Scaffold this active site. Structure first.
Site, mmCIF file in Angstrom:
data_model
loop_
_atom_site.group_PDB
_atom_site.id
_atom_site.type_symbol
_atom_site.label_atom_id
_atom_site.label_comp_id
_atom_site.label_asym_id
_atom_site.label_seq_id
_atom_site.Cartn_x
_atom_site.Cartn_y
_atom_site.Cartn_z
ATOM 1 N N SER B 46 0.798 -1.285 0.221
ATOM 2 C CA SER B 46 -0.057 -0.084 0.086
ATOM 3 C C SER B 46 0.904 1.034 0.163
ATOM 4 O O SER B 46 0.765 2.198 -0.857
ATOM 5 C CB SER B 46 -0.973 -0.065 1.196
ATOM 6 O OG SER B 46 -1.760 -1.277 1.113
ATOM 7 N N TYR B 109 -13.694 -4.525 -4.081
ATOM 8 C CA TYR B 109 -14.461 -4.218 -5.170
ATOM 9 C C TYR B 109 -16.043 -5.075 -5.011
ATOM 10 O O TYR B 109 -16.716 -4.584 -4.586
ATOM 11 C CB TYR B 109 -14.083 -3.903 -6.259
ATOM 12 C CG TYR B 109 -15.295 -3.162 -7.300
ATOM 13 C CD1 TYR B 109 -16.026 -3.798 -8.148
ATOM 14 C CD2 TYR B 109 -15.111 -1.662 -7.391
ATOM 15 C CE1 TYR B 109 -17.347 -2.997 -8.659
ATOM 16 C CE2 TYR B 109 -16.069 -1.070 -8.056
ATOM 17 C CZ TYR B 109 -17.039 -1.730 -8.604
ATOM 18 O OH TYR B 109 -17.904 -1.154 -9.460
ATOM 19 N N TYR B 136 -2.704 -10.428 3.793
ATOM 20 C CA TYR B 136 -2.180 -8.974 4.076
ATOM 21 C C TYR B 136 -3.646 -8.516 4.410
ATOM 22 O O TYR B 136 -4.847 -8.467 3.886
ATOM 23 C CB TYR B 136 -2.064 -7.999 2.528
ATOM 24 C CG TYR B 136 -1.883 -6.694 3.042
ATOM 25 C CD1 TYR B 136 -1.284 -6.000 4.134
ATOM 26 C CD2 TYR B 136 -1.419 -6.011 1.833
ATOM 27 C CE1 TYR B 136 -1.128 -4.735 4.373
ATOM 28 C CE2 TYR B 136 -0.914 -4.423 1.900
ATOM 29 C CZ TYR B 136 -0.843 -3.954 3.175
ATOM 30 O OH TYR B 136 -0.808 -2.430 3.225
ATOM 31 N N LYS B 164 0.577 -10.126 7.232
ATOM 32 C CA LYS B 164 0.880 -8.860 7.674
ATOM 33 C C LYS B 164 -0.523 -8.264 7.998
ATOM 34 O O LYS B 164 -1.486 -8.217 7.395
ATOM 35 C CB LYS B 164 1.311 -8.320 6.570
ATOM 36 C CG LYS B 164 1.531 -6.787 6.626
ATOM 37 C CD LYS B 164 1.951 -5.898 5.707
ATOM 38 C CE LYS B 164 1.769 -4.344 5.835
ATOM 39 N NZ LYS B 164 1.983 -3.178 4.883
#
Lengths: 310, 310, 310, 308
Positions: B46, B109, B136, B164
């Site tokens: 990110s 989405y 993640y 993570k």
């Protein structure tokens, strides 16, 4: 420059079992929609599984639709991606394919802000200034709500040609229509509802059309509904809308204790289309879950009973 | 077979003013991090503006990082995309580039479901079974929370090598570590915190490492902190963490009344890096907003006062 | 005035099967807590089923606690109600009963705003200016987050004596502690965590105490934990916290497919207390659901294994 | 037994400057509503500042309304509280005052569950089984959504007489009406919308009535709207709804940079004071006051769009 009003379904993407685009079935679906009476086609929208198709697959589906449509109705192309540079790549693809309009959302995945959303739309518009750009309000997928004041500002500036609103909030859509009309922007800024079950409400408030996923299954029902609304036959419209809302039960058949609403809803649509002989199968893109043989039988029974006849 | 534990910053992507990848600054950043004592690098996360870069740009940044690293520390590659087929395209890019691990999120989405999230990770793993795949958890961006029972199931099956976790919920991270340990999955499943301000907490609870965005600015601070934690010097660690948390104030300088948290946060980081002479400028990808001169001066002042000194 | 720091459990309310307050068991619970080494008692908090008790029942429970406590430790009183005038009625009740502190939340049910939350606390304080007023941050129940800047403004003004933070966000609690300390409000404004599983984290960051529901079941464990932390024995503290976190599994026994988290959690606590002979039964207020014999057997086994031994 | 259909505003509570109930203004408001053509009154609802009134104040307001109404229209009483035992206290108060119906929400503050929500409503019903009990769906305040399958189960069992739905989700309300009709529960279970701006939609889908906060200000507008809808005059109804929606702009005048309750209910009371129905726009603590500029703007909107 094409005008996007009336009944404009978000065309689905039929697939083979290996996940590739079923081009032959996609052509049959395009014919199904056009001969069903629709006024335009929205390619690569949410219900077209745009978020599931690769860029190359999107290009194939878009080109297939535009080529087979053969000018019969206008086709607008979704350019759904996380941020501006990635959206603009899709705008370039859309122009290459001969799209007649664009549909874009706010940025997503990244945190955003009304200021950044506005810049996003301005820069998308600049990549294809001759195409009508519609703003796609779909908070369930992008987790922003499009500011209606910003939309009308962009309408006044000629950046946006319209909005497709899939928020499910008819009070908010109505307020936007009223704001638009009071600002004298009625002709410049088309407002399309993404609703499948409150289309008569939208037309009663003066919306310009509808982009209904269920319109893939029963395009003739939505064509007939729009016609009743435009003729001011509101009682008759409400009665038809109620029947359409019973067809809509196909999206609730899939057991969402072990699948998403996309699996159940889009799966229900594809199951109906296969039953009607329009597409080869109800194959879905990964990681959609399959519907059971029992679920498909229930979907068939609903289609049999409530598909529009007249 | 590479092991991803310890301090593993999500490498930023320095840019030119025209939005292209600034390769020379990216190389300098890589050296900054490695010479700062980090244990690995997370490319295309990110904080690397992965959501803003095109697929081609991602490939350039990843290849630049891997080649300049020259095997000094392992590099894991983000494959962040909306759904499985699109993620697998990026896995293919990652393998081509010689990535040593993969980092993927839940689908986004699209609406999703734990069942579909699980299938997603299994299919990603199948595309590169020899690479460690980390899940993640970043609800602020994908708007699903990764089910900890599902993660441990996938760890037991060898599908996931770790997670993570950027949820910001240290109680939840602690519970997952406890469940992992109780299941006998301690060595098999690494748990890295994405926290920048509660790294000592994570290590106290037995976490395996940290993926801190602020680690781009001050890798030596996070290396020093990890070492205190590894040595069981918890009081000393808390004192250093507090100092780090005052450096972290750089992300709160940007006025979010007219920019996103990404503009303020990542912009803050890049402003610091430019001030330290590591990258050429604080250029951000569209549609990020620019920081003002007053804001950058405040960032400079914070950096001057709270950057790590031993 | 009394000082509320250290271990301050939110005292539960034992009930008869008919829903009335079990005064005899409530006295035994008060003794259990005080002899377990706690530093204060929080009467009529969430874990006290304050939201389930009538105003009359609250008064009975409060008076019972204060009188049986007999000055051994200070008692603070919840004044949880939707809005300000209703809260002030309960402040009057608390004063009548001889409470030594007050605990209030933001307004709820009604829409609110930081400006209105601030006025709310100022007006509550004005009704009993000699009592320490703590702000209870519990977003899961009131659906506002207490603004930390506002909290410190009220601290500087002498309106708030502290906060009990049950948000579950240890990063945010830490940031508030840091902000308090940087503003020189350390002594004026006590910060208590409502966490049950990350108490060591809070003390490491310099929190003043803890208000743990599970402290009803095992006051001695939390007393021992606090002492380890104050003595700087962080590794030993973390080990004890881990054992406490396994005792905490009693809240996960109840089948939440047919009850609320309150039924499972508070029911679990009461089941443990009945097992320990401290209260007559695990009777809960309507509309809580009952735990099965199978569930209670599981709770008993967890308590037997993980209860602390002083 | 009373029947709660048609236009049923949630009666506001006028206040004195010290926050006490202003009973003289409350009586004037009741007449304003009844003479404006409403079909019933909902006392102690959200727009009545029920969450702000003490139990003693709720009793006084309810008594004042019921006595002044003097049987002209039926009055239903809100019994809004966090959990079942506290709600039942209010049910007892309502019976004492002679309420003719009850309005309850799901439990709030506490975490809850559909199983516990259902038990909640059954036990509230058992405390006053001869009164029609309406379930109040208002997720913005209670942070539960009432399960429509549960509501219809309760309707079939005779526990619920209806629902007041203030979710703002017209598709969901429409689906509930369809499900009700499909289950043969049309007569047993009244569905009232809490919408102020999509009342015509609700009637087009076959709703039984409306509980609009703005109906305090312009009861005659909503009475006229309902009549148009019942007469099947949908185009005329939509035109009137549009006018009503411009009157509704009074709730957007207050600067929400410094709550929606302050702006919205404050907007209503400002209009009522301007029309001479109540003494002032005094609001319960901790509502914020509207500025002179804001009240001037509200006055101008009222002057232009009030129904004639």
């Amino acid at each position: 420059s094409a005008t996007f009003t009336g009944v404009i379904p978000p065309v689905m993407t039929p697939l083979h079992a290996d996940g590739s685009v079923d081009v032959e079935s996609l052509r049959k679906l395009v014919d199904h929609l056009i001969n069903g009476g629709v006024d335009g086609l929205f390619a690569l929208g949410s219900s077209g599984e745009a978020a599931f198709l690769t860029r190359a697959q999107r290009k194939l589906a878009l080109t297939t639709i535009i080529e087979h449509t053969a000018g019969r109705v206008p086709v607008t192309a979704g350019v759904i991606e996380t941020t501006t540079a990635r959206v603009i790549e899709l705008v370039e693809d859309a122009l290459e394919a001969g799209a007649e309009g664009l549909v874009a959302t706010a940025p997503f995945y990244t945190r955003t802000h009304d200021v950044e959303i506005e810049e996003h739309f301005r820069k998308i518009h600049a990549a294809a200034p001759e195409l009508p750009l519609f703003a796609y309000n779909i908070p369930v997928s992008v987790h922003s709500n499009l500011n209606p004041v910003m939309l009308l500002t962009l309408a006044k500036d000629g950046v946006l040609a319209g909005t497709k609103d899939s928020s499910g909030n008819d009070g908010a859509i109505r307020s936007l229509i009223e704001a638009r009309d009071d600002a004298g922007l009625t002709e410049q800024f088309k407002i399309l509802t993404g609703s499948e079950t409150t289309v008569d409400f939208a037309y009663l408030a003066g919306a310009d059309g509808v982009v209904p996923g269920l319109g893939n299954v029963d395009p003739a029902a939505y064509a007939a509904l729009a016609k009743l609304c435009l003729d001011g036959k509101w009682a008759e419209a409400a009665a038809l809308q109620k029947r359409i809302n019973h067809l809509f039960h196909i999206v609730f058949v899939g057991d969402t204790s072990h699948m998403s609403g996309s699996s159940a809803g889009l799966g229900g649509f594809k199951t109906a289309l296969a039953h009607l002989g329009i597409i080869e199968s109800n194959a879905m893109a990964v990681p959609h879950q399959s519907l059971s043989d029992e679920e498909t039988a229930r979907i068939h029974a609903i289609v049999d009973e409530f598909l529009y006849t007249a």
